[PDB]
């Protein structure tokens, strides 16, 4: 499973729910090889593949857990790939949409005990935890997160 398998498997529930165009994963792969998003989250490996957003019909997040970590390139220079265990796929219509969730995810990946729960929870327990935290946020209205956006790989 390379980055392209991970992206297309995470974009698949988005395209079926009618929130991104048909060739959505191919756009985010194109931007992944231009401005990658490998993040050495202080404990775990985290990648946030996202895109421009004119082909995005609604803001959504698709979460993917990697039991076997996969190398992702990081934007922070350093031609040393990142061992990534959690993938946060993002689709936002406008620049104003993506900036809000990006700071929210920055607070997600700087919460070790929360983050440690993701590694050893099922697709149901993960949805219950991210939904409850998205609900408590005063922003984040307009992002969609249903039970079909959690996938282990």
């Amino acid at each position: 499973v390379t980055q392209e398998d991970i992206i297309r498997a995470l974009a698949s529930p988005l395209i079926k729910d009618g929130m991104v165009d048909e060739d959505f994963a191919e756009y985010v792969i194109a931007r992944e090889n231009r401005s990658p998003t490998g993040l050495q989250a202080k404990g775990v490996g985290v990648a946030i593949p996202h895109t421009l957003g004119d082909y995005v019909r609604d803001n959504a997040i698709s979460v993917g857990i990697l039991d076997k970590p996969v190398n992702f390139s990081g934007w922070y220079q350093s031609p040393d790939p990142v061992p990534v265990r959690v993938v946060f796929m993002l689709a936002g219509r406008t620049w104003d949409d993506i900036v809000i969730v990006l700071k929210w995810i920055k607070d997600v990946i700087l919460d070790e005990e929360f983050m440690k729960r993701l590694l050893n929870m099922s697709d149901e327990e993960i949805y219950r935890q991210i939904y409850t935290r998205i609900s408590k946020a005063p922003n984040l209205s307009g992002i969609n997160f249903s039970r079909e956006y959690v996938r282990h790989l």
Partner: antibody
Amino acid sequence: EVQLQQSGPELVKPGASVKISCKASGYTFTDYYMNWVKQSHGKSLEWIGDINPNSGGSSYNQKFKARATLTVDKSSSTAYMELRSLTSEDSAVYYCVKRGDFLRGYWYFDVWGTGTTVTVSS
Amino acid sequence: DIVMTQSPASLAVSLGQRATISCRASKSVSTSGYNYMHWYQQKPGQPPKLLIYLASNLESGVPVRFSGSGSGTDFTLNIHPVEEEDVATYYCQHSRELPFTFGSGTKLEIKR
């Protein structure tokens, strides 16, 4: 009942700018996207742009772009549209219209505003 | 952009007859199992009202005498019994890609 009460009619001199208000009620204001549609004197509809009331992010039609500005006021549940460098071609009726579908990408329109007549002349 | 050729420009039917409004899109506005097509009714001096969304679904409150069909590029709005209050102008609209475009409009006047 969902209601989109709009501002009053406006007379604008050519080259100036106008800003139209659109108060919303009867639903959680930030939940649904807000759109603006212009209907010329020929009763032909042209979509101007959408705005996310929660993030402020807006997408515009290319024809009206660089002249249209979409803003919201989250406290009062009011949507604003600003059109600059007005000419006689922009003399039309401007509607604020609600999305209708919550989070599905349907992107239809369920409720059209009361309407604001904008006349541009010297 | 997508050009939508709505037809007919004017439609004269008798009371209780059948009214058929057609709308053709210059591109396939259907993607996945989603037909991004919507119909609106604008009575004279009123803002438009939503009739059909997703080319077949009736909005809550719209009487069952309105129907929608079509897939791909050709779509049709039908009124099985035409009533006296149905005199208005009907517009089609696509949600496939930005910018959204409308049809030129179909004016329904009933014979008498």
